[PDB]
Design a protein around this nucleic acid. Structure first.
Length: 58
DNA sequence: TTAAATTTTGCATACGATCGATTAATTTTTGAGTGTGTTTTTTTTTTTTTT
């Protein structure tokens, strides 16, 4: 989520998994990536969905 | 010595040259009337993301 320069409103931004909605996401050097950065993708890799609750946006 | 022909000179007069009085276009102004734009943004605080 991010704040737009026009009207300062909180709007969503698509991540890497949003751009692979019917495709393949590919991770190189998976072990050396941080645990917070490794395993933030549980809901996309299990529920096939991204549930977001931040900045008044669900 | 005296009378007629002739050409000159003064004067009146009519016609053009030129300035002046008047006057009609014109075109610039004449502000008068009318349409219209206008305050003004402002750091401060929250939340998030990366560092």
């Amino acid at each position: 989520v991010r704040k737009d320069p026009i009207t300062k409103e909180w709007t969503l931004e698509g991540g890497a998994l949003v751009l692979a909605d019917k495709g393949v996401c590919l991770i190189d050097e998976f072990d050396k990536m941080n645990d917070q950065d490794r395993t933030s993708i549980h809901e996309a890799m299990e529920q096939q969905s991204i549930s977001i609750s931040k900045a008044g946006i669900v």
